[model samples]
Target: PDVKCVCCTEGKECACFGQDCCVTGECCKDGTCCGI
Candidate 1:
């Protein structure tokens, strides 16, 4: 599982579980809000 890219959301960041991604355009393997 990878971290989600937050840059795609404009100011918004990809939230992985209880953590956030440091970079943008990151593909999260197990991230989709559904698991959250």
Candidate 2:
């Protein structure tokens, strides 16, 4: 399985992923919302 990025909405930064998911585009994996 693909490692999903952490959430960046509501002002939350995850230490796992490199950048914020909200800065770029919708965080989706396998046609599902991964970090949205």
Candidate 3:
């Protein structure tokens, strides 16, 4: 599933399957990241 960033930014949608895929170190509060 495509995870969307709740905040406003360039990379809104991440193609990661889960929030643990925070490769960019931008882990969201809702348990997500800025794509992996």
Candidate 4:
């Protein structure tokens, strides 16, 4: 696929959709969280 920038952020339990940018400093990408 490709790299997508999830506009969602702020708080835990946000690691949603697997590859997404959450507010908990957990930017999910591939199989892990890509730090903000």
Candidate 5:
């Protein structure tokens, strides 16, 4: 599948898997970005 612009919750960057997309809109804390 073609990569697309992905949206995320303010504190969660990944809500799905199996495909890839450009991640944006996340809160940074410590040394880790909001990813799941």
Candidate 6:
């Protein structure tokens, strides 16, 4: 499924663990990519 960022920044294809800050193809927090 397409993960949506809670923060709503970038559209990422991360796996859904249904948890905050889940690690997948990229570092995500509730569906949002971590900013550098």
Model 5, C-alpha of 25: deviation from truth (Å)? 16
Compare candidates 2 and 4 on TM-score and give the better one. Answer: 2
For candidate 4, give the lDDT of residue 20.
33
> Which portions of model 3 miss their true places by more than 4 Å?
1-11, 23-36
Runs of candidate 4 with Cα error greater than 4 angstroms are 1-10, 13-26, 34-36
> What global local distance difference test value does model 6 have?
0.42
What lDDT tens digits, residue by residue, belong to model 4 across residues 1-36?
343434343333433544434433245445664333
Residue 5 in model 6: lDDT:
44
Q: If scored against the real structure, what TM-score would every candidate get?
A: 0.16, 0.19, 0.22, 0.17, 0.16, 0.22
Q: Candidate 5 — which residues are off by over 4 angstroms?
A: 7-12, 20-36
After superposition on all C-alphas, the RMSD of every candidate to the true structure, in Å, is: 6.8, 9.0, 7.7, 9.2, 9.1, 7.9
Displacement of residue 32 (Cα, Å) in model 4 is 1.8
Give the clashing residue pairs of candidate 5, or none: none
- Model 6 lDDT per residue over 1-36, tens place: 444343323444435445544423344434445445
lDDT per residue (tens digit) for residues 1-36 in model 5: 233333333323444532333332222223443255
Task: List the lowest-lDDT window of 10 residues for candidate 3.
Answer: 1-10
Worst 10 residues of 5 by lDDT: 20-29
CA lDDT of each prediction against the hidden true structure: 0.39, 0.41, 0.45, 0.41, 0.34, 0.42
Cα error of candidate 5 at position 11, Å: 12
Q: What does candidate 2's lDDT look like per residue over 1-36, in tens digits?
A: 223343534334544345544344345334533433
RMSD of 4: 9.2
- Residue 28 shift from truth in candidate 4, angstroms: 1.2
